[PDB]
Design an enzyme around this catalytic site. Structure first.
Site, PDB file in Angstrom:
ATOM      1  N   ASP A 138       0.830  -1.197   0.000  1.00 28.99           N
ATOM      2  CA  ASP A 138       0.000   0.000   0.000  1.00 28.99           C
ATOM      3  C   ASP A 138       0.856   1.235   0.000  1.00 28.99           C
ATOM      4  O   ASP A 138       1.836   1.312   0.754  1.00 28.99           O
ATOM      5  CB  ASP A 138      -0.911   0.005   1.221  1.00 28.99           C
ATOM      6  N   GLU A 193       0.372  -0.789  -5.113  1.00 26.30           N
ATOM      7  CA  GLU A 193      -0.829   0.034  -5.027  1.00 26.30           C
ATOM      8  C   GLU A 193      -0.390   1.432  -5.449  1.00 26.30           C
ATOM      9  O   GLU A 193       0.377   2.106  -4.750  1.00 26.30           O
ATOM     10  CB  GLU A 193      -1.465   0.060  -3.634  1.00 26.30           C
ATOM     11  N   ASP A 230     -11.642  -0.912   0.532  1.00 24.31           N
ATOM     12  CA  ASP A 230     -11.922   0.493   0.890  1.00 24.31           C
ATOM     13  C   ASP A 230     -13.138   1.064   0.125  1.00 24.31           C
ATOM     14  O   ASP A 230     -13.611   2.157   0.443  1.00 24.31           O
ATOM     15  CB  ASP A 230     -10.736   1.366   0.528  1.00 24.31           C
TER      16      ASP A 230
HETATM   17  O1  LIG Z   1      -7.566   2.389  13.357  1.00 23.45           O
HETATM   18  C1  LIG Z   1      -7.619   3.727  13.879  1.00 23.45           C
HETATM   19  C2  LIG Z   1      -7.668   4.743  12.757  1.00 23.45           C
HETATM   20  O2  LIG Z   1      -8.892   4.513  12.041  1.00 23.45           O
HETATM   21  C3  LIG Z   1      -8.949   5.247  10.814  1.00 23.45           C
HETATM   22  O3  LIG Z   1      -7.846   4.945   9.949  1.00 23.45           O
HETATM   23  C4  LIG Z   1      -8.089   3.781   9.150  1.00 23.45           C
HETATM   24  C5  LIG Z   1      -8.725   4.163   7.814  1.00 23.45           C
HETATM   25  O4  LIG Z   1      -9.978   4.842   7.966  1.00 23.45           O
HETATM   26  C6  LIG Z   1      -8.949   2.901   6.999  1.00 23.45           C
HETATM   27  O5  LIG Z   1      -9.473   3.252   5.738  1.00 23.45           O
HETATM   28  C7  LIG Z   1      -7.636   2.139   6.811  1.00 23.45           C
HETATM   29  O6  LIG Z   1      -6.810   2.860   5.953  1.00 23.45           O
HETATM   30  C8  LIG Z   1      -5.906   2.093   5.160  1.00 23.45           C
HETATM   31  C9  LIG Z   1      -6.590   1.557   3.889  1.00 23.45           C
HETATM   32  O7  LIG Z   1      -7.637   0.639   4.189  1.00 23.45           O
HETATM   33  C10 LIG Z   1      -5.558   0.937   2.963  1.00 23.45           C
HETATM   34  O8  LIG Z   1      -6.108   0.517   1.716  1.00 23.45           O
HETATM   35  C11 LIG Z   1      -4.446   1.949   2.699  1.00 23.45           C
HETATM   36  O9  LIG Z   1      -5.030   3.092   2.042  1.00 23.45           O
HETATM   37  C12 LIG Z   1      -4.145   4.187   1.777  1.00 23.45           C
HETATM   38  C13 LIG Z   1      -3.432   4.033   0.439  1.00 23.45           C
HETATM   39  O10 LIG Z   1      -2.506   2.962   0.521  1.00 23.45           O
HETATM   40  C14 LIG Z   1      -2.638   5.281   0.085  1.00 23.45           C
HETATM   41  O11 LIG Z   1      -2.091   5.173  -1.220  1.00 23.45           O
HETATM   42  C15 LIG Z   1      -3.499   6.534   0.199  1.00 23.45           C
HETATM   43  O12 LIG Z   1      -4.458   6.534  -0.854  1.00 23.45           O
HETATM   44  C16 LIG Z   1      -5.202   7.746  -0.904  1.00 23.45           C
HETATM   45  C17 LIG Z   1      -4.503   8.708  -1.851  1.00 23.45           C
HETATM   46  O13 LIG Z   1      -3.239   9.068  -1.310  1.00 23.45           O
HETATM   47  C18 LIG Z   1      -5.338   9.963  -2.107  1.00 23.45           C
HETATM   48  O14 LIG Z   1      -4.762  10.704  -3.182  1.00 23.45           O
HETATM   49  C19 LIG Z   1      -6.782   9.622  -2.464  1.00 23.45           C
HETATM   50  O15 LIG Z   1      -6.803   9.156  -3.845  1.00 23.45           O
HETATM   51  C20 LIG Z   1      -8.116   8.800  -4.301  1.00 23.45           C
HETATM   52  C21 LIG Z   1      -8.834  10.002  -4.917  1.00 23.45           C
HETATM   53  O16 LIG Z   1      -9.089  11.001  -3.932  1.00 23.45           O
HETATM   54  C22 LIG Z   1     -10.164   9.588  -5.550  1.00 23.45           C
HETATM   55  O17 LIG Z   1     -10.735  10.709  -6.221  1.00 23.45           O
HETATM   56  C23 LIG Z   1      -9.990   8.410  -6.519  1.00 23.45           C
HETATM   57  O18 LIG Z   1      -9.319   8.850  -7.723  1.00 23.45           O
HETATM   58  C24 LIG Z   1      -9.658   8.195  -8.951  1.00 23.45           C
HETATM   59  C25 LIG Z   1     -10.536   9.128  -9.790  1.00 23.45           C
HETATM   60  O19 LIG Z   1     -11.865   9.070  -9.277  1.00 23.45           O
HETATM   61  C26 LIG Z   1     -10.552   8.773 -11.279  1.00 23.45           C
HETATM   62  O20 LIG Z   1     -11.102   9.852 -12.038  1.00 23.45           O
HETATM   63  C27 LIG Z   1      -9.161   8.471 -11.837  1.00 23.45           C
HETATM   64  O21 LIG Z   1      -8.483   9.705 -12.077  1.00 23.45           O
HETATM   65  C28 LIG Z   1      -7.568   9.703 -13.174  1.00 23.45           C
HETATM   66  C29 LIG Z   1      -8.132  10.491 -14.361  1.00 23.45           C
HETATM   67  O22 LIG Z   1      -9.282   9.869 -14.920  1.00 23.45           O
HETATM   68  C30 LIG Z   1      -7.088  10.676 -15.456  1.00 23.45           C
HETATM   69  O23 LIG Z   1      -7.590  11.564 -16.444  1.00 23.45           O
HETATM   70  C31 LIG Z   1      -5.768  11.216 -14.894  1.00 23.45           C
HETATM   71  O24 LIG Z   1      -5.872  12.594 -14.521  1.00 23.45           O
HETATM   72  O25 LIG Z   1      -5.344  10.406 -13.793  1.00 23.45           O
HETATM   73  C32 LIG Z   1      -6.280  10.376 -12.704  1.00 23.45           C
HETATM   74  C33 LIG Z   1      -5.590   9.665 -11.561  1.00 23.45           C
HETATM   75  O26 LIG Z   1      -5.145   8.379 -11.964  1.00 23.45           O
HETATM   76  O27 LIG Z   1      -8.482   7.529 -11.004  1.00 23.45           O
HETATM   77  C34 LIG Z   1      -8.321   7.893  -9.619  1.00 23.45           C
HETATM   78  C35 LIG Z   1      -7.604   6.741  -8.961  1.00 23.45           C
HETATM   79  O28 LIG Z   1      -6.411   6.408  -9.661  1.00 23.45           O
HETATM   80  O29 LIG Z   1      -9.293   7.341  -5.859  1.00 23.45           O
HETATM   81  C36 LIG Z   1      -7.989   7.694  -5.348  1.00 23.45           C
HETATM   82  C37 LIG Z   1      -7.369   6.420  -4.817  1.00 23.45           C
HETATM   83  O30 LIG Z   1      -8.058   5.927  -3.687  1.00 23.45           O
HETATM   84  O31 LIG Z   1      -7.332   8.724  -1.489  1.00 23.45           O
HETATM   85  C38 LIG Z   1      -6.610   7.479  -1.431  1.00 23.45           C
HETATM   86  C39 LIG Z   1      -7.435   6.506  -0.611  1.00 23.45           C
HETATM   87  O32 LIG Z   1      -7.545   6.899   0.748  1.00 23.45           O
HETATM   88  O33 LIG Z   1      -4.097   6.591   1.498  1.00 23.45           O
HETATM   89  C40 LIG Z   1      -4.956   5.476   1.787  1.00 23.45           C
HETATM   90  C41 LIG Z   1      -5.611   5.780   3.112  1.00 23.45           C
HETATM   91  O34 LIG Z   1      -6.396   6.953   3.019  1.00 23.45           O
HETATM   92  O35 LIG Z   1      -3.838   2.311   3.930  1.00 23.45           O
HETATM   93  C42 LIG Z   1      -4.765   3.026   4.763  1.00 23.45           C
HETATM   94  C43 LIG Z   1      -3.963   3.619   5.913  1.00 23.45           C
HETATM   95  O36 LIG Z   1      -3.400   2.605   6.694  1.00 23.45           O
HETATM   96  O37 LIG Z   1      -7.017   1.896   8.065  1.00 23.45           O
HETATM   97  C44 LIG Z   1      -6.767   3.067   8.859  1.00 23.45           C
HETATM   98  C45 LIG Z   1      -6.054   2.570  10.092  1.00 23.45           C
HETATM   99  O38 LIG Z   1      -6.890   1.719  10.847  1.00 23.45           O
HETATM  100  C46 LIG Z   1      -8.887   6.750  11.094  1.00 23.45           C
HETATM  101  O39 LIG Z   1      -8.819   7.465   9.867  1.00 23.45           O
HETATM  102  C47 LIG Z   1      -7.659   7.076  11.938  1.00 23.45           C
HETATM  103  O40 LIG Z   1      -7.650   8.452  12.281  1.00 23.45           O
HETATM  104  C48 LIG Z   1      -7.619   6.207  13.191  1.00 23.45           C
HETATM  105  O41 LIG Z   1      -6.430   6.489  13.923  1.00 23.45           O
END
Ligand SMILES: OC[C@H]1O[C@H](O[C@H]2[C@H](O)[C@@H](O)[C@@H](O[C@H]3[C@H](O)[C@@H](O)[C@@H](O[C@H]4[C@H](O)[C@@H](O)[C@@H](O[C@H]5[C@H](O)[C@@H](O)[C@@H](O[C@H]6[C@H](O)[C@@H](O)[C@@H](O[C@H]7[C@H](O)[C@@H](O)[C@@H](O[C@H]8[C@H](O)[C@@H](O)[C@@H](O)O[C@@H]8CO)O[C@@H]7CO)O[C@@H]6CO)O[C@@H]5CO)O[C@@H]4CO)O[C@@H]3CO)O[C@@H]2CO)[C@H](O)[C@@H](O)[C@@H]1O
Ligand SMILES: OC[C@H]1O[C@H](O[C@H]2[C@H](O)[C@@H](O)[C@@H](O[C@H]3[C@H](O)[C@@H](O)[C@@H](O[C@H]4[C@H](O)[C@@H](O)[C@@H](O[C@H]5[C@H](O)[C@@H](O)[C@@H](O[C@H]6[C@H](O)[C@@H](O)[C@@H](O[C@H]7[C@H](O)[C@@H](O)[C@@H](O[C@H]8[C@H](O)[C@@H](O)[C@@H](O[C@H]9[C@H](O)[C@@H](O)[C@@H](O)O[C@@H]9CO)O[C@@H]8CO)O[C@@H]7CO)O[C@@H]6CO)O[C@@H]5CO)O[C@@H]4CO)O[C@@H]3CO)O[C@@H]2CO)[C@H](O)[C@@H](O)[C@@H]1O
Lengths: 512, 517
Positions: free
Chosen positions: A309, A356, A409
Site C-alpha cells: 500500500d 498500489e 476500501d
Molecule cells: O484504526 C484507527 C484509525 O482509524 C482510521 O484509519 C483507518 C482508515 O480509515 C482505513 O481506511 C484504513 O486505511 C488504510 C486503507 O484501508 C488501505 O487501503 C491503505 O489506504 C491508503 C493508500 O494505501 C494510500 O495510497 C493513500 O491513498 C489515498 C490517496 O493518497 C489519495 O490521493 C486519495 O486518492 C483517491 C482520490 O481522492 C479519488 O478521487 C480516486 O481517484 C480516482 C478518480 O476518481 C478517477 O477519475 C481516476 O483519475 C484519473 C483520471 O481519470 C485521469 O484523467 C488522470 O488525470 O489520472 C487520474 C488519476 O489516476 O483515477 C483515480 C484513482 O487512480 O481514488 C484515489 C485512490 O483511492 O485517497 C486514497 C485513498 O484513501 O491513502 C490510503 C488511506 O487513506 O492504507 C490506509 C492507511 O493505513 O485503516 C486506517 C487505520 O486503521 C482513522 O482514519 C484514523 O484516524 C484512526 O487512527
C-alpha cells in the site's frame, strides 16, 4: 547464415506461452470473514472449504488483507506489529487435532453475524492460552518444532523484540513507549533481562502463540498450493509508532533524541494526516536496508505475492511536522528508489510485489514501478469519471496489472451503483454489458475478466451480490468497519451456481 | 538525494502520454472503389470527398491496397511493376484542371456498378495518352515539374527500367521476358540504346503518365495530411517474374544462367492447410543483396515512403525464414525453409532511409524467429476479428489477447464482409461470438464487430468501408484462389459521402467512448 537451409526442426520452432504470463483470476476475502461458531473466521475448516470452492471456480489467487494483530476496532491497517500474526485467527478445532485442546473444552457456539473483536477475544483467548501452555509444558515433536521456530534466525530477528515489546506493554500502564521509563524505553540490556525474568511466562506464551499462528497459516498456504491457488498478502508501506518495529529499530526512523517522531506520514490535498513515523532512508542505506530486507523475508514466509500500500512512498513521500493537526502543511521528500529493491534482491532473491499506485502519482512513481517489473492496479469503480483517458477503463488497461472491481476500501458494486452519479451511470451503461440492476456486480466482474490485465481480483461480497451493508471499510470512519462475515446460511456447498457462472466467464476470457 | 526536499513543482510532475502511443482508427478503401462516370474510381473529387468524410468521423488513417498497375483481372497483388502507379486511377477531370484535356473531350458517362478493367481502359487510356502527349509537347511550369520528376535520382532509379521494360513488352509479342531475344532479355547496352531510339515516344509517354499519377496521388496525400489523415499503403514481400523489378536486377534474384527462376515462393502444408500454397514468384538472392547493403530493398522502401505515411508488408515472415520450392514442382510440399536476412535488412533500410513505419502481416502459424524479428524492429502485427472465434480462449485474435502495438481489423480485403461472414459462420463459432460481442440487431452485426475492434487495446483499428456500409457478400473485395470476379467492388452509385452523416456520428461516438479521437 542468410539464404541457407534451416534445420528440418524449423516448422516446430513455434512461440511458447511464457508460464509467467498466464492469465488468472481470484477473490479478495479476509479470513475473519469466514463462517463459524467462535465469533470470527479462522484458519480451520472454512479456510480449506473456501480454497476448494475457489479451485472449483477456476480461480488461482486468493488475496487477504494484512494478517497482523489488528487494533481494537478490528483494523488490519493499524497493526500492533508488522510481522506477527493475528492470534484470533487460530482455529480451536485445529488445536484439538494437534492434541493441545480436547473437544470437550471447546465453547458453546455464539451468534455473531458480524465480527465483534471483544466477544471473539473473550471466547477464544483463554483456550488459545491453555493450548499454548500445554505446548510449552510438553516435550514432544511439537515442542521440538516450537524450538526450531524460536531459534530460527529469520524468525528471531523480529519475534524476540515483538514478544519483549508486548510483555512490557502488558506490564506497564502507559499510553506508548515514549512514556516508558528510560531503561525500558531505550532497551537497556539489564532491563530487558529483568523483563524476561519477571514476565517469562507471558513471553514464552506469546512466542508459542506466534508459533501456533505460523503452523496453521502455513498449513493453509500449503493447502492453497496443493489446489493451484497462490496467496497474495498485503503490506502497508508504513508501520505504527507504538510497535516493536519502531521501538527496537529507532535509528531506522526519523525520531528526535527523545524518540519522538520529527515528521509523520500523510498525503497533501484537505489531504490526509495518517500520523505514522517515517523511515530514515539514509540511515537504512548504511546497513544495506536490513530492516526492509527482513520485512520482505517475513512477507515471503507468509505469502506467494504481496501488495504494498502506498508504493509511491518509495519514490517520493509526504512529510508533515509531527506537531501538526493537518496534512496540508508538509513537504515532499525523496524516497530510496530502486537501490532499496536492489538490496532486497541481493538479500532475498526474486520477489512478487503488486504496487498500489492509485490516485494522482508522479512520473518517478511510474518509472520506479516499471524498473522493478511490478504490476500496478486498475479499479473499475473509478473508471466512469472524466473522459476516455481514465486509466481504469478496460481499453486503457495494461497486461502487467491487477484489475479489481473494487477494494476493501470501496463499497460493493451494488452499493456503489446505488449512489452513483447520473453522468457516471449513463457512461457505465455504454461501456458495460448490463442486464438487471440486481446483477450489476456480475456486469462489472465480466468487465474485469474481459480485460487484458493478467490478473483480475473480485471481492467475495460482489460474487455474493451483496449491498452496502457488506462493505468492509469506509475510509476515515473509526467505528463499524472490518466486521463483515459471509452470511451464516451461505455455505461453500450452496454456491455451485456462482461457481459455474465464474468458471464460464474465466473460460470465455482465457483465465482458466 | 534521499530524504531531502523535492522542488515545489513535484506535485505537477505528472506522467505525459507519449504522442507516438496515440490510439486511432481508420478505414480500408481502395480508390478503384470510388463512385464516378468513367468505369473505375480515381484520384479526383471522390478521393477528396472521402478524406473529408473520414476526417468527420474522427478516423485518422486511410489504408489502400497496392497502387501498382494491376493484372488483367484487376489484382493489385499481381502487379506489372512494384513501383509504378496504376495509371487508370488518373482523374480525367483533374487533367482538365491542368489544361491537358478540354471538357469537351471527356467521354459520355458509363454505368459500371462494378469495375470492369477492360471497359475502363478502353474509355480512359486514349485520353490519358492525349494528355500525356500535350504535357511532353508543351513548355511551361508543368513541363518543368515533369523534368524535375524524371531527373530526380530517387525516381530515375526505378522509372527508367520500368519504362524500357514496358516499351519492349509493348513492341514484342512474347509471353514473358524469358522468351525475349537475347540482347533484350539480357539488357545489352546497344540494344537498350536502340530501343530508346525506336520507342522514344512510348518511353516519354510512359514516364509522363507516371508523372501524372505522382502529381495526382501527391495532391491526395497532401490533402489527407492537411485533414489529419495518414495513408497506409501495402507492399507484398515478393514481386512478379515478368516485371522490370526482376529483369533489370537479375543478380538480386535466385535465377539460373538462362534467367529462369531456380526456386519459387509458397508456403508449406500447415495445421490449417492440407497442401500449402504454390505462389510461384521468384525469390530474392538475399546473400547477393547483402553485398550491396540491400540497395534494391532500400530503393523499394524509399518509393514506399514517397507514396505513403506507413506501409503493411504482406508475408513479413519471409524476412525471417522463407519457403522455397523447386521451380519445376507442381506442388508446394516439395520445398524447404531458408534463412531470411533478418534485422540486418532493417538496419540497412534505417541507415539508407531513416525512420520507417511498417505494419507486419504476420497471420497464421509463424515461428519464434518471426515474432522476435517483428519485435526487434518495433513493428506492429495484426489481429483479425473474423478469425477470433475458432478454437479456445487462447486464440490471438480474441480482444483479451490483443497487444497495444498491433493493428486490429474486423476483416481484410481477402475476407468476406462481416455480414457475409456472419451468414455462413459455423454454429459453434457463432455461439461463441454471441457471448463475446455486444449484439443488437443481427442486421447490424458489422457494427458489433466494429465496436469490438475499437474497444481493443490495439493502438490502431481499421475497418473496411463495406462494413461501415453494412454490406453483404456481394461486396466482398476478393476470394482467395479464385481467378475471376475479384477486385471490382465499388461504393453503390446512390451512396454519397454527403449522405453518410448517421454512420459518421456512430463512428465518432464509438471513437470517443474508446479514446481513439
Ligand atoms: O484504526 C484507527 C484509525 O482509524 C482510521 O484509519 C483507518 C482508515 O480509515 C482505513 O481506511 C484504513 O486505511 C488504510 C486503507 O484501508 C488501505 O487501503 C491503505 O489506504 C491508503 C493508500 O494505501 C494510500 O495510497 C493513500 O491513498 C489515498 C490517496 O493518497 C489519495 O490521493 C486519495 O486518492 C483517491 C482520490 O481522492 C479519488 O478521487 C480516486 O481517484 C480516482 C478518480 O476518481 C478517477 O477519475 C481516476 O483519475 C484519473 C483520471 O481519470 C485521469 O484523467 C488522470 O488525470 O489520472 C487520474 C488519476 O489516476 O483515477 C483515480 C484513482 O487512480 O481514488 C484515489 C485512490 O483511492 O485517497 C486514497 C485513498 O484513501 O491513502 C490510503 C488511506 O487513506 O492504507 C490506509 C492507511 O493505513 O485503516 C486506517 C487505520 O486503521 C482513522 O482514519 C484514523 O484516524 C484512526 O487512527
Ligand atoms: O492474378 C492471377 C492470380 O490470381 C490468383 O492469385 C491471387 C489470389 O487469389 C488473391 O487472393 C491475391 O493474393 C494476395 C492476397 O490478397 C494478399 O493478402 C497476400 O496474401 C498472402 C499473405 O500475405 C501470406 O502471408 C499468406 O497467407 C496465408 C498463410 O501463409 C497460410 O498459412 C494460410 O493461413 C491462414 C490459415 O490457413 C487460416 O486457418 C487462418 O488462420 C487462423 C486460425 O483459423 C485461427 O484459429 C487462429 O489460429 C491460432 C490458434 O487459435 C492458436 O491456438 C495457435 O495455434 C497453435 C496450436 O494451438 C498449437 O497446438 C500448435 O499447433 O501451434 C499452433 C500455432 O502456434 O495459433 C494459431 C495461429 O495464430 O489464427 C489464424 C490466423 O492467425 O488464417 C490464416 C491467415 O490467412 O492462408 C493465408 C492466406 O492465404 O499467403 C497469402 C496468399 O495466399 O498476398 C497474396 C498474393 O500472393 O492476389 C493473388 C495474385 O493476384 C490465383 O490464385 C493465382 O494462381 C493467379 O495466378
Amino acid at each position: 547464415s542468410v539464404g541457407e537451409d534451416f534445420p528440418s526442426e524449423y516448422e516446430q520452432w513455434l512461440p511458447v506461452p511464457d508460464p509467467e504470463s498466464r492469465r488468472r483470476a481470484g477473490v479478495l476475502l479476509h479470513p475473519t470473514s469466514f463462517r463459524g461458531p467462535h465469533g470470527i473466521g479462522d484458519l480451520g475448516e472454512e479456510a480449506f472449504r473456501f480454497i476448494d470452492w475457489l479451485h472449483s471456480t477456476g480461480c488461482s489467487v486468493w488475496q487477504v488483507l494484512p494478517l497482523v494483530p489488528p487494533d481494537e476496532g478490528g483494523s488490519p491497517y493499524a497493526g500492533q506489529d508488522a510481522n506477527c500474526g493475528n492470534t484470533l485467527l487460530i482455529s480451536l478445532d485445529e488445536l484439538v487435532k494437534d492434541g493441545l485442546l480436547i473437544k470437550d473444552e471447546l465453547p458453546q457456539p455464539i451468534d455473531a453475524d458480524s465480527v465483534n473483536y471483544q466477544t471473539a477475544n473473550k471466547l477464544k483467548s483463554p483456550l488459545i492460552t491453555k493450548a499454548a501452555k500445554r505446548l510449552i509444558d510438553g516435550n514432544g515433536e511439537l515442542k521440538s518444532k516450537l524450538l526450531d521456530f524460536r531459534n530460527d534466525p529469520s524468525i528471531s530477528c523480529w519475534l524476540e523484540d515483538a514478544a519483549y515489546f508486548a510483555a512490557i506493554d502488558n506490564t506497564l500502564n502507559a499510553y506508548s513507549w515514549f512514556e516508558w521509563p528510560e531503561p525500558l524505553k531505550n532497551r537497556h540490556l539489564s532491563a530487558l533481562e529483568a523483563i524476561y525474568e519477571s514476565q517469562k511466562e507471558f513471553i514464552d506464551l506469546f512466542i508459542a502463540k506466534q508459533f501456533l499462528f505460523q503452523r496453521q497459516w502455513q498449513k493453509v498456504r500449503e493447502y492453497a498450493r496443493r489446489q493451484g491457488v497462490d496467496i497474495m498478502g498485503d503490506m502497508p508501506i508504513y508501520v505504527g509508532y507504538h510497535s516493536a518495529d519502531v521501538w527496537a529499530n529507532k535509528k531506522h526512523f526519523l525520531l528526535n533524541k527523545k524518540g519522538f517522531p520529527l515528521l509523520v506520514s500523510g498525503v497533501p490535498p484537505t489531504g490526509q494526516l495518517w500520523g505514522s513515523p517515517l523511515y530514515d532512508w539514509k540511515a537504512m542505506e548504511s546497513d544495506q536496508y536490513s530492516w526492509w530486507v527482513n520485512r520482505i523475508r517475513r512477507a515471503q514466509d507468509l505469502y506467494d505475492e504481496c501488495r504494498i500500500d502506498h508504493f509511491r512512498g518509495f519514490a517520493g513521500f509526504w512529510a508533515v511536522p509531527s506537531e501538526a493537526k493537518v496534512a496540508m502543511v508538509g513537504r515532499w521528500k525523496v524516497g530510496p528508489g530502486k537501490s532499496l529493491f536492489d538490496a532486497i534482491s541481493k538479500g532475498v532473491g526474486k520477489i512478487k510485489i503488486i504496487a498500489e499506485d492509485l490516485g494522482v502519482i508522479t512520473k518517478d512513481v511510474v518509472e520506479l514501478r516499471k524498473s522493478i517489473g511490478a504490476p500496478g492496479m486498475a479499479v473499475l469503480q473509478f473508471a466512469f469519471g472524466g473522459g476516455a483517458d481514465n486509466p481504469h477503463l478496460p481499453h486503457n488497461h495494461e497486461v502487467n496489472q491487477v484489475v479489481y472491481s473494487g477494494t476493501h476500501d470501496n463499497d460493493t458494486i451494488r452499493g456503489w451503483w446505488d449512489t452513483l452519479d447520473q453522468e457516471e451511470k449513463s457512461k457505465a451503461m455504454k461501456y458495460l454489458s448490463i442486464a438487471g440492476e440486481d446483477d450489476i456486480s456480475w456486469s462489472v466482474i465480466q468487465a474485469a475478466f474481459s480485460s487484458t490485465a493478467q490478473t483480475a481480483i473480485i471481492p467475495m461480497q460482489d460474487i455474493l451480490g451483496l449491498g452496502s451493508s457488506a462493505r468492509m471499510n469506509t475510509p476515515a470512519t473509526e467505528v463499524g468497519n472490518w466486521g463483515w462475515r459471509i452470511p451464516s446460511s451461505t455455505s461453500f456447498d450452496n454456491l455451485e451456481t456462482e461457481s459455474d457462472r465464474l468458471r464460464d466467464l474465466l473460460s470465455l476470457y482465457g483465465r482458466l
